[PDB]
Nucleic acid binder design. Sequence first.
DNA 1: AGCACAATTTAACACTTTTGTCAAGCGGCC
DNA 2: GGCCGCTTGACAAAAGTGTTAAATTGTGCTATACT
Lengths: 92, 1084, 110
Amino acid sequence: AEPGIDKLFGMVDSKYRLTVVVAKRAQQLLRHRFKNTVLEPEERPKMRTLEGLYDDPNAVTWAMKELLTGRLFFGENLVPEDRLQKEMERLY
Amino acid sequence: EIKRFGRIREVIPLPPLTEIQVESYKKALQADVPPEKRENVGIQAAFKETFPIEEGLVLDFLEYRIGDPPFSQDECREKDLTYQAPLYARLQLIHKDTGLIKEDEVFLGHLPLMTEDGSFIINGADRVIVSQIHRSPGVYFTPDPARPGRYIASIIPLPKRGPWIDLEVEASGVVTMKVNKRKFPLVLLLRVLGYDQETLVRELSGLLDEAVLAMRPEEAMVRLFTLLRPGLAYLFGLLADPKRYDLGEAGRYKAEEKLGVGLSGRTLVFKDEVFLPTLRYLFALTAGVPGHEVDDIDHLGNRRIRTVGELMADQFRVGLARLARGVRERMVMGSPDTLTPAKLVNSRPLEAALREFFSRSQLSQFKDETNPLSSLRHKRRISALGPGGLTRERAGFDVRDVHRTHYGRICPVETPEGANIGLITSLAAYARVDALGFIRTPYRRVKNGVVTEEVVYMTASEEDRYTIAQANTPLEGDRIATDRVVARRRGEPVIVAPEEVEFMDVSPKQVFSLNTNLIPFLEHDDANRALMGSNMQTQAVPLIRAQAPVVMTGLEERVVRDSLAALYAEEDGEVVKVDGTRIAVRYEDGRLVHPLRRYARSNQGTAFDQRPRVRVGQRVDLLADGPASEEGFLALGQNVLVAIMPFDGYNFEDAIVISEELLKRDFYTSIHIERYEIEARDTKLGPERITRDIPHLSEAALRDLDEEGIVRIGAEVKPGDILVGRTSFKGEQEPSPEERLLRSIFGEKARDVKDTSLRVPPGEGGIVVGRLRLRRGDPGVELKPGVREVVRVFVAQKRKLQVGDKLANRHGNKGVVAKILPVEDMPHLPDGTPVDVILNPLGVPSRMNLGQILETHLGLAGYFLGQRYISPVFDGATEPEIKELLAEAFNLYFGKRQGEGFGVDKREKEVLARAEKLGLVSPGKSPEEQLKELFDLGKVVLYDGRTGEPFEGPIVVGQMFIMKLYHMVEDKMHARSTGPYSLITQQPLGGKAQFGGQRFGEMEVWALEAYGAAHTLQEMLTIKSDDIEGRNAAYQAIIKGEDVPEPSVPESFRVLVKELQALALDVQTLDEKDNPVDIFEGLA
Amino acid sequence: RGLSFLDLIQEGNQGLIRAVEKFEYKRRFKFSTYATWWIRQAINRAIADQARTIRIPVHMVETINKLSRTARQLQQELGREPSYEEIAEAMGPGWDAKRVEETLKIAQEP
DNA sequence: AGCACAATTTAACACTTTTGTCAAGCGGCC
DNA sequence: GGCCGCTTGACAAAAGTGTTAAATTGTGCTATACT
C-alpha cells in the first residue's frame, strides 16, 4: 500500500478527489519547479540504492506525503486558472 | 528389465493401426489394379456416375491410369510443390457416321496421392485430413421434440448430395411431405406415384382428405411446381445425382431391414420407392406392435465414418461435374475447327477445384508432426464438423445432446478438449476392420480361438468384458455381462459352449483409444483430468534424451514402427553398418544404403533426428531409433525422481519445482527450427537483387558473416542481424530537405536503394544449417509470376530450459517451473541424490483427484531393484502388488547403509515418533521395521539442503514422469512501444522488424473505468493506438521533457464518422452552445 | 469469365441497339440469328472492358486466353504443367519468358 | 476469334541549350 | 613580397521543346449459321 494512504481518505470527502490533488500537485511540485516542496528538512522523501541517497524521480509519491504535512489546500478556490502561471512565474 | 504385468494376451492390436488410410487409397484409388475388374468405390465410381454427356456427339469414359509422379518425395518438402501424380483416362467422342475417335489415354491432369506414412504432402506442409461422421441414410423418423407427434426425417445419401426428405404430421393437412424445401400435401405428390385412390388406400393404409389432388397425373406435376419455388421434379429420386443410395451399403441396406423388402437404391424413380414403405411403417408405427421408434440416439450403428476414400470420391465428382458442363458448351459451338477429346477437356476445373480441397477445407489441418503419436491421432481423430451441417462450434440449433457420450465402446471418452467437444475424439485400437467402408465394426472373442466382427449393432446373447477368466470357462459364477445400456448383474449360460454369442472384449484397450491405453495407471483419475494429459502427448516436443517412462504399456511397441518414426530391417541381417548419417546395408538381398532423415524438418519447429544402434552385424528387428524414442520404446517426455511437498511457495496452486541438476546434464532440452523466405520483387520501377554491399549498412557485421548476400552456412547469428540483405531500387522517399545536410556532412554521399533487408525476428539465437537459392531461369520451380530469387534459409537454436513451460505427466497434473534452485538447497536424500523435481499437491490431487502418485511409489522401487515395470490399463498393478516390490527395494536400499558403516539416524528416528502417534507406522520393534513399512507406502525421512533440519513428517519420494509441452515462454512473450504500426487500421500491427501486437479485451475497459481511472482509460485511446497525430505528442514529449500529454484526439472516430458518412448520417460535433455546431476534422 | 448473368444482359441486349440499326435489308437473308452475334461480340468486347482487373484491352484478353488455351494445350500433351519459358516456343516471335510472365502478372480476375 | 484502317491518340525519348559547379586568375590586404 | 580572398572563365551535367513511334476505340465490320 502507501505510507499513510488511509489517512489520505479521511481528509478528502471522496476517494476520487484525492487522486486529482495528488497529481495536480505533482504537476507543480517537480515538473513546474522541484523547489516547491514543503517537505525540505529531514522529511524529504529519498531513496537508498547501491549508490547513495537521492530524490526519487517520481513525484506522485511526494504528493501523498505533501498532502499530509497539513499544508496545501484543495477544493473550489481561485477561479482564474491562468493565475497559476503568475504564481509559478515568481518561482522562475 | 521386463516386469510384465499383463494376463492372457490373445490376438494382437489391429495392425497396422493406420488401416483407415490404406483402406482409403486401396478401396477407392483402384489405380494399382487392372481395369479388367474392380467395381466402383472411388475414381471408377464417380467416374462412371458421370452419365454419357449429351449435347450424336457423345463422349464416353473408359479405363484410367495413375502413377509415375513428377517430383518424388523430399523434392516436395523442399521446393513446395506437392506429390500430385498425373491421372488420365481414355476418352472417345462418338456421333452418327463413323465417329470412333479415341485419344491416346487423354492426358488429363494431376492428383495428389498418399504415402506409406499414412499422410499427404500439400505445399511442402505435408498435411492430413480427418474423416467426418453423420447419420447414415434411411428413415429414422425422429421423435418430435416440441409436441407429441412422431414425424419423419429421411436422411439423404450425403449432406452435399441430395434433397433432405421429410414427413411431418400436424393439424392443417396432416402428414405433409417436404423434401429439401417444400410445403405440399403428401397426397398431391402421392398421386404422381401412380397411386391416387383404391390402390394406396385400404391396400396399404386425414389421408386422401384432398381427393381433388389425387385424380389426374399431369395436374399433380403442375400443382406441385406451383407450390414450390416462386410463381425441379427432374430430381428428388429421379436420375443419379440428387437421390441415389449407391455403393450397396448404408443407404441401400436399410429399408430392407427397416421398412420392408425391396429397394432400387433411390426413392421415387414416377414410380414410388420410399414414399410407400414410409407411411406403411409409419401408420403401423403410430399405436402399433412394431415399435422400433428408436431415434438416432447417437447410435454408432447409424453413424457413418466416411473415410478419405469416399471423402475425395465426392469432391472429385463435384469437380468432374464442371468438365461435363464445359464439354457441352464446347459441343454447342464450332465443329471442324477444334473438337477432339483432349481439347474439350481441360486440366483446370477437375484439378484446381480438386487441389483447393487439400490446401483449404478444415479437415486438411496442418499434420501435427510434433511427434509420432500426434501424426497418428489425425487418421483416427475423426470429427462431425466440415462440409456437413454438423459443424458450427459453440452453438448450432441443438447439439447439446449430439456431442454428449454414447453407448459406443468403440470410441474413447477422453480425447476432446473444450471449444469443440464431441466433435473431436479418436478411434479405438481394435476398431476399423474388414469392410469398414460402411459403418464401424469392433472385435469380439468367443472364449475360443476366434474373433468375429458382427458390427457394432451386435446384441446377440449380450456380452461380457474382459474380467476374471479361467481356461475358457471362468469359474466366476457371475460373469460380468453388459447388454445395451446397464449391465444386468451377470448371465453365465452355465455351459461348456463358446460364449454368450460374443461375451469377450479380448483386451481392455478396446475401450479407450490407442492414445489413452498408453497411459501407465489409467484407472485412478477422472475424465477431464486424464483429458489434458492425453492431449499433452500431442505436443510433448521430442527430445534427444528420451529416457522412456518407467511404467509403460506394451502398446508403444508399435507406436515406433507404425508411425514410421524409426526405420526397419528387411529379410536377413548382416548390417556391417558404417553408421554416421547413412546406415549401411544388410546381407539379405542386394545392397541398399539407408540414408537418415538428417534431422529433417518439423512443421512445428522441432526437427526430429534418428540415431542408429548397431555395428559389425546383428538382426533381431529394430534398427535406429527416431525422434523421441528409445529401443522401439516410445519415449515422449522424461522420467526423473520427484518429491511431493511444498517449498516456500514455489509451487502454489499447481506450479512445479525444478533443480539445477537437470540443466547441468541438459536433461530437458529440445530443438526448434524456422524456415525463412525473402522474395526479390520486380515492381518494374526498380528490380530487387541480393548483394553484400547494402547502402549505409557499410559495416563489419555484414562482410563478416554475410558476403555475396546470403549468410554463410554454419554461422551463429543472433536477433537484430542481417540474413538476406536484398537491394531494391524502389524509391518511395526522395531526399529530405535538412536531411541533405547530414548526408553531405559525412564522407558518404546519397543513396537510391535504401537498406531494406530481412533483419532477424524478435527471437532467434542459434545457427544456420543450410540455405537454398531458388531464382527464376529454372522451369522446375513453380513460383509466383514476376518473382525472382526466392532465398530460403533454415535457422536452428538449442532450447535448454529456462523458467516456466508446462510439464504435465500422463494423468493431468500440469504446472509451471517457478524457480530452479542450484543443487545446494532441495531435499537431500539420506544418501545423496538431491530431489531433482518437487511436485507439491494442490490443484488436482484433492480436487480433480487422479492417480499419478501410484507411479512415484513404484518409481524408486524400480530404481533400486533396477527394473522398469509395465502396467497395462485395467489389468495388473494394484496396491498389494506394490507391497511385494517395496520389500525387495527396501532391504536393497537400507542394505547398503546398514553395510556401509551405519544404520538408522537420529533425525531419521524422530520422524518415526510422528507416524507412531500419527497412526501411520505401527509401534513395536526397532526403527528398522518402522522405516520399512514407511517405505512401502511412503519414502525415507528425507531432509532439506537449505534450512538444515529434516522435514518433520513422512515425505514421499520416487521417480514418475516429467514431460514438457510445446508451449514454452521464449516464443510466448512480446514487448514494444511506439515502434508498431498498421496504417489504414489505425493500430499497432505488422512491421518489417517487429511483429508486435496487443489487444485490450472489451471486458477489460469496463473494469478499468470501474475505478477512478479516467485519464488512464482515455490514455489507452488518447496518445497510443487511436490518435496517430497524437502518438508523437507523448513519445516526443517524454524524450524531450516532462509536460502533460494532449487532451486526446481519436483516430478511428474520424474513420467512424467517415465510414458512417458514407451515407446521409452526418456525425456533427455539436458543441455545448448548440448554434455554433463545432466540427473538428478540417486538417487542423 | 466476368460479370454476372444479370450484368452480361446489359452489354448484350445493348448490342442490339446498334445491330438492328445497321441492318442490310438488301440481301435476301432476312434478319434472324444475326444479332445473335452482335451480342457476344459486344460481350467479348465487354468482358474485356469490364472485369475484376484494371484495364484489359483487346490485346490482353485475347492473349491471356491464348496463353491459357496453350497452357492447357501443352498440358493435355505433356502430363505436367508447362513453365513460363517452355511456353515461348508455343507462341512465336517476341514471346520469350519475361513478357509472357508480364501477361499473367497483371491480372485476369485475381 | 478477331485484323484493319484509320484515325487518332498516348507515351516517351532525345536534342541543343542552359545552368551549375569547379578551378584558375587577379586584386587587395597584411 | 607573400598570402588570402574574391571574381571570372571554362567545363561538365542535366532540363524545355521537338520529334517520332507505339497503342486503343470505334466502328467497321468482319462472318457464319439458323429461322
